[PDB]
Amino acid sequence: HMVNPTVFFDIAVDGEPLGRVSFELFADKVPKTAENFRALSTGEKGFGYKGSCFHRIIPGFMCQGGDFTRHNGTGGKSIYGEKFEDENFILKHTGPGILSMANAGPNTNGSQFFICTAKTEWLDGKHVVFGKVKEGMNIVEAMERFGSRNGKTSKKITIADCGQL
Ligand SMILES: CC(C)[C@@H]1NC(=O)C(C)(C)/C=C/c2ccc3ccc(nc3c2)[C@@H](C)OC(=O)[C@@H]2CCCN(N2)C(=O)[C@H](C)NC1=O
């Protein structure tokens, strides 16, 4: 029987450790999308999230990260190539803690993702939901205090380490 994978991020604020966020990846519903995020979290293909930052944090909305090639929301790449398709839209943006793919149009998933800090139901059917925060929502809430209305962060919020549990 297959078990959904768990990954973790160790978060830092201007280099100072803050805490750990862990995620369940819904490989039972979106295996291709879950596998991309899993592999980028372990770095096992030779690239991935370690060291990257959350470039946009809007309190009461979401935290966005995963751009390890341009560091500002314009880049990133998947383990399948620069982009891959929307796998399905079975899962919805139901509340805080949902983990979903960022994109720039249909079938443009890369490595960027966001963590909801509110219900974002208007994104249902256009961003692929593929996981949820398991432990550490308190750490996501602490990250949120470094965001702003326009999303610029007041301190640099990084993934100091990440991997699979
Ligand atoms: C994946 C990456 C390559 C894409 N980048 C772009 O398309 C380019 C590079 C053109 C920048 C877009 C951009 C910039 C600032 C900004 C500022 C504020 C907003 N949206 C913003 C969107 C605000 C309304 O919505 C968000 O914050 C949403 C939330 C869900 C994740 N999410 N953001 C995306 O998936 C956006 C839609 N896509 C990208 O970030």
Side-chain angles (χ1 to χ4, degrees), residues 6-56:
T6 303
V7 298
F8 72 89
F9 293 170
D10 288 330
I11 299 300
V13 179
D14 279 348
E16 297 301 318
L18 175 67
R20 177 172 284 194
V21 182
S22 65
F23 310 92
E24 177 181 357
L25 313 180
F26 298 131
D28 59 339
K29 310 279 177 50
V30 278
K32 182 173 183 164
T33 308
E35 175 58 17
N36 178 60
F37 187 93
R38 188 201 66 72
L40 293 170
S41 294
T42 65
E44 62 195 66
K45 314 287 188 188
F47 53 90
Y49 296 135
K50 184 173 183 180
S52 67
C53 76
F54 284 81
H55 61 273
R56 182 168 306 114

Side-chain angles (χ1 to χ4, degrees), residues 56 58 61-62 64 73-75 101-104 112 114 123 127:
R56 182 168 306 114
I58 298 167
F61 181 16
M62 58 86 231
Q64 183 177 342
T74 61
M101 288 309 282
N103 68 53
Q112 287 185 58
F114 60 105
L123 302 177
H127 295 264

Side-chain angles (χ1 to χ4, degrees), residues 55-58 61-65 67 72-76 93 100-105 108-116 120 122-123 126-127 149-151:
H55 61 273
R56 182 168 306 114
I57 295 179
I58 298 167
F61 181 16
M62 58 86 231
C63 301
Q64 183 177 342
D67 182 1
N72 63 1
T74 61
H93 295 83
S100 183
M101 288 309 282
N103 68 53
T108 60
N109 299 292
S111 58
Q112 287 185 58
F113 62 86
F114 60 105
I115 303 168
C116 298
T120 60
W122 62 89
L123 302 177
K126 68 162 178 203
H127 295 264
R149 289 287 308 276
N150 66 28

Side-chain angles (χ1 to χ4, degrees), residues 59-81 84-96:
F61 181 16
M62 58 86 231
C63 301
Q64 183 177 342
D67 182 1
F68 57 81
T69 68
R70 299 188 178 279
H71 331 297
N72 63 1
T74 61
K77 65 182 183 180
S78 83
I79 65 173
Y80 310 117
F84 66 109
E85 69 271 18
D86 298 312
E87 183 170 11
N88 66 55
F89 295 102
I90 291 169
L91 297 173
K92 312 306 181 189
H93 295 83
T94 50

